Short mmCIF file of C-alpha atoms in Angstrom, two decimals:
data_model
loop_
_atom_site.label_atom_id
_atom_site.label_comp_id
_atom_site.label_asym_id
_atom_site.label_seq_id
_atom_site.Cartn_x
_atom_site.Cartn_y
_atom_site.Cartn_z
CA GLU A 1 167.64 314.67 96.13
CA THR A 2 164.40 312.72 96.20
CA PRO A 3 162.29 313.47 93.18
CA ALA A 4 160.15 310.82 91.30
CA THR A 5 162.06 307.96 90.63
CA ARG A 6 160.09 306.26 87.76
CA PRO A 7 159.89 307.91 84.52
CA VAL A 8 156.62 309.57 85.08
CA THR A 9 154.55 312.57 83.32
CA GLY A 10 157.40 313.17 81.03
CA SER A 11 157.76 317.05 81.47
CA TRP A 12 156.44 317.41 84.80
CA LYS A 13 157.74 315.33 87.53
CA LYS A 14 156.73 315.32 91.14
CA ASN A 15 159.25 316.16 93.94
CA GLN A 16 159.56 315.20 97.51
CA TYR A 17 157.24 317.82 98.81
CA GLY A 18 154.63 316.56 96.53
CA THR A 19 154.95 319.68 94.37
CA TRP A 20 154.89 318.98 90.39
CA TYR A 21 157.70 320.73 88.82
CA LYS A 22 159.54 320.68 85.27
CA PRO A 23 162.80 322.35 84.42
CA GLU A 24 162.16 324.93 82.06
CA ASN A 25 164.08 327.96 81.28
CA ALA A 26 162.05 330.97 80.08
CA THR A 27 161.32 334.47 80.44
CA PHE A 28 158.31 335.51 82.33
CA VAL A 29 157.16 339.01 81.54
CA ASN A 30 154.92 339.95 84.29
CA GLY A 31 151.80 341.56 83.02
CA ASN A 32 149.89 344.59 84.45
CA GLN A 33 149.73 343.40 87.84
CA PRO A 34 152.27 342.99 90.66
CA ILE A 35 152.85 339.36 91.71
CA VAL A 36 153.55 338.26 95.39
CA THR A 37 156.76 336.24 95.16
CA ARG A 38 157.81 333.21 97.71
CA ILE A 39 161.18 331.93 98.74
CA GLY A 40 162.35 328.33 99.11
CA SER A 41 158.85 326.95 98.46
CA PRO A 42 156.10 327.28 96.00
CA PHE A 43 153.21 328.03 98.41
CA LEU A 44 150.86 330.98 99.56
CA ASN A 45 152.02 329.93 103.15
CA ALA A 46 155.66 330.20 102.01
CA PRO A 47 157.92 333.21 102.99
CA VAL A 48 157.39 336.24 100.96
CA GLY A 49 160.23 337.41 98.97
CA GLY A 50 158.55 340.60 98.01
CA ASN A 51 156.24 341.77 94.97
CA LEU A 52 157.39 341.38 91.73
CA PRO A 53 156.62 344.57 89.71
CA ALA A 54 154.37 344.54 86.76
CA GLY A 55 156.28 344.44 83.67
CA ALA A 56 159.45 342.78 85.14
CA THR A 57 161.16 340.23 83.03
CA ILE A 58 162.05 337.12 85.16
CA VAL A 59 164.17 334.55 83.57
CA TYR A 60 163.11 331.30 85.52
CA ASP A 61 164.49 327.65 85.29
CA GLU A 62 161.46 325.87 86.61
CA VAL A 63 157.92 325.62 86.77
CA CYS A 64 156.12 324.12 89.55
CA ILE A 65 152.38 323.43 90.47
CA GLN A 66 151.17 323.83 94.18
CA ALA A 67 148.59 325.38 96.27
CA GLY A 68 146.51 325.60 93.10
CA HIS A 69 148.91 327.92 91.43
CA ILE A 70 151.43 327.44 88.99
CA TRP A 71 154.75 328.85 90.00
CA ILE A 72 158.02 329.73 88.33
CA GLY A 73 161.13 328.79 90.07
CA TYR A 74 164.09 331.17 89.78
CA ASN A 75 166.75 332.40 91.94
CA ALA A 76 167.44 335.77 93.47
CA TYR A 77 170.98 337.24 93.57
CA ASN A 78 171.16 336.09 97.08
CA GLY A 79 170.61 332.70 96.07
CA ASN A 80 166.97 332.59 97.20
CA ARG A 81 164.58 330.17 95.35
CA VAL A 82 161.96 332.62 94.63
CA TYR A 83 158.77 331.38 93.43
CA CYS A 84 156.36 333.60 91.55
CA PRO A 85 152.75 332.39 90.83
CA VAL A 86 152.12 333.01 87.30
CA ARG A 87 148.71 331.47 86.81
CA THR A 88 146.37 329.10 88.48
CA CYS A 89 145.91 325.33 88.05
CA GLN A 90 142.96 323.51 88.79
CA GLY A 91 144.17 320.16 90.19
CA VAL A 92 147.69 318.34 89.46
CA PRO A 93 149.20 317.00 86.14
CA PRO A 94 149.17 315.23 83.81
CA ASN A 95 145.53 316.57 83.86
CA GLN A 96 146.48 320.12 84.98
CA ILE A 97 144.04 323.01 84.34
CA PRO A 98 146.12 325.97 83.93
CA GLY A 99 144.08 329.33 84.02
CA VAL A 100 144.87 332.55 82.36
CA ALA A 101 148.72 333.49 82.70
CA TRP A 102 149.67 336.74 84.53
CA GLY A 103 152.23 337.28 82.07
CA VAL A 104 154.11 335.97 79.10
CA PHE A 105 156.47 333.01 78.78
CA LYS A 106 159.23 333.37 76.46
#
């Protein structure tokens, strides 16, 4: 597995890649802009899965922080780990600074 072994940061925890994540099951309703989604990894340098249409409702199970962005981790029908950037984050938690969301989080 390789996550953070010690009880750290509570909600957020850092994985082996140095990506901060948290398991959170929510619905992300994309706003008025299509978002570039990634697969496997939450990076701008990660393989692109496609663009998420504006107004698409995503059910995600994870939120990650990497590449100055906050990402949502969900799976596609092919089993792809799709990461959609949902907002920016200046720095890494616990002192994270999340920018405006590109949608809603239900």
